[PDB]
Design a protein around this ligand. Structure first.
Ligand SMILES: Nc1ccc(C(=O)O)cc1
Ligand SMILES: Nc1ccc(C(=O)O)cc1
Ligand SMILES: [Cl-]
Ligand SMILES: [Cl-]
Ligand SMILES: [Cl-]
Ligand SMILES: [Cl-]
Ligand SMILES: [Cl-]
Ligand SMILES: [Cl-]
Ligand SMILES: [Cl-]
Ligand SMILES: [Cl-]
Ligand SMILES: [Cl-]
Ligand SMILES: [Cl-]
Lengths: 303, 303
């Protein structure tokens, strides 16, 4: 809604950018592990057909398994390439969507995968890391759990890179300025590298498809306020030059998910693209998976 | 609002793409001039500091002056370079914002310029052409007025190019799919080359800044329906590689203007961009210029 008391100038000077934003995190693995205090950490990599990169991501994380990290899972989304065997060969446990939650038939898209991984994991903290990363850094998981383990009151940590992204810069952040202005303090709201506490994640809906990350950001903000969110610098990463046609369909789902969270009536109509004319249509989903907490008791595996 | 009866598939197969969309316009200047039937045509080029390109755009249009075109005006927006003298030297009349409407102090931005040009022009049809075009084609004005002069019931003509644009493809068209799905049939809703009848243009508000084009599209659609809009192929044009930082600020104003037209409460908060951090803020306007018709009677020059 209309917030004429807030300006872009005092968003740039917002105290949150100091106390909840780590440009140069200096935490050690040993001192993070010391702060677990009986909490466990689950790392989840969503994956659909990522055979060329999934092993390299898993290998950056595997040395933490059994110390800082308690579970390392690739949640496979129906890959037909060698994603699964390569993740296993790299030292990760691989769980299909069906095995994560066999009572419920899979919907397509990324959010489904992350939602199901709540039923497959046991960590008090869950870290999500994209499996398509071309050059992952082994300090990702430590930097993401830093504010959860050491700060107070943080429940969602968003990892950003110094160069980000055409959808992030033209779609997500300008819409947040219009609909959730305080969230413009988040550098990369769509980023795939982030960590959350279990109670938070079990009690929010998961948006479908590519809306999942911005949906968690906005639901966490709405539920707990800006102080409960933090961001940390993961380092440098090259913008993978994705086709604008793919980015357009993803943008449409980002819009749908944000409108869904902000009371904006979305038409539900998918995006048409023209290239006479050669038309290309995509679909968009307006239906969340409900909070996983609502399924407690009905599951053959406890939550 | 929610339109679950419409899908992206039947938008791609929409009859409008045949009867109101000209992929290969074949009109001659002589036969268009024959159809004027006493209507006059005003061509308007908005311009702020366009000394390198404005003359070349004017020269592509000047041979039509006195035949198909009755007025050729560059509406200068406070240029400090040689925009004005170069437009004059190319054969255009140059009118400042103040001379267009001296009773009202200028607001910044492009929409202000186009709104003021309604008071400075006399054509029954007004054609807007950007002055920063690097390679304008002399058939722009004929192709834009074709459907106005020959078809029935068209009041707004949008000229598109075969390659368009990151803001168009990731922001404008996906938001239209969410908020005004039928308008996704328009290939380039933000395009600067378009023509409109005077009665229509005098009776709609003009959005400020870079929102002006999408605001006219949505107001025309809301007021008169999709049949009153048409689009024509102008040919090929190179995407001028504008900085993503500029595109982000323009996207924010596009969003504000669309939310303004579609009942979506916009925060009014400008876009912050970060590059410690180096913050960069822009402003956004939620205030239209009212329909120029509302100022009739109060102007020292008649409308
Ligand atoms: N079904 C899908 C599962 C995962 C992903 C992804 O990780 O980007 C995308 C689609
Ligand atoms: N004040 C302005 C006037 C004109 C333009 C433009 O034509 O892009 C931009 C700004
Ligand atoms: Cl502001
Ligand atoms: Cl800091
Ligand atoms: Cl089901
Ligand atoms: Cl992006
Ligand atoms: Cl919580
Ligand atoms: Cl659809
Ligand atoms: Cl046609
Ligand atoms: Cl004034
Ligand atoms: Cl564009
Ligand atoms: Cl009208």
């Amino acid at each position: 809604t209309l917030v004429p008391d807030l300006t872009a100038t005092d968003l740039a000077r917002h105290r949150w950018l100091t106390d909840n934003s780590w440009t140069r995190p200096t935490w050690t693995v040993a001192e993070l592990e010391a702060a677990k205090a009986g909490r466990t950490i689950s790392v989840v990599l969503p994956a659909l057909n990522e055979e060329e990169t999934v092993g390299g991501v898993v290998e950056t994380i595997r040395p933490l398994l059994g110390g800082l990290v308690d579970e390392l899972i690739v949640l496979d989304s129906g890959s037909t390439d060698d994603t699964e065997i390569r993740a296993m060969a790299a030292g990760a446990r691989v769980i299909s969507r069906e095995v994560a939650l066999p009572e419920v038939a899979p919907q397509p898209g990324k959010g489904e995968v992350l939602w199901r991984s709540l039923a497959a994991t046991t960590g008090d903290i869950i870290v999500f890391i994209d499996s398509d990363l071309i050059d992952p850094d082994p300090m990702f998981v430590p930097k993401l759990v830093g504010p959860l383990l050491l700060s107070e009151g943080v429940h969602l940590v968003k990892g950003f890179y110094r160069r980000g992204g055409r959808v992030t810069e033209l779609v997500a952040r300008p819409l947040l300025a219009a609909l959730r202005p305080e969230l413009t303090c988040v550098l990369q709201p769509l980023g795939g590298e982030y960590a959350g506490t279990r109670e938070l994640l079990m009690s929010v809906p998961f948006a479908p498809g590519y809306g999942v990350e911005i949906g968690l950001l906005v639901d966490t903000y709405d539920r707990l306020g800006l102080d409960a969110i933090a961001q940390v610098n993961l380092g440098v990463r090259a913008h993978r030059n994705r086709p604008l046609t793919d980015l357009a369909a993803m943008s449409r789902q980002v819009i749908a998910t944000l409108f869904s969270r902000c009371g904006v009536p979305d038409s539900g109509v998918g995006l048409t693209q023209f290239f006479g004319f050669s038309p290309r249509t995509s679909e968009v989903s307006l239906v969340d998976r409900p909070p996983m907490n609502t399924l407690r008791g009905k599951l053959a595996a406890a939550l």
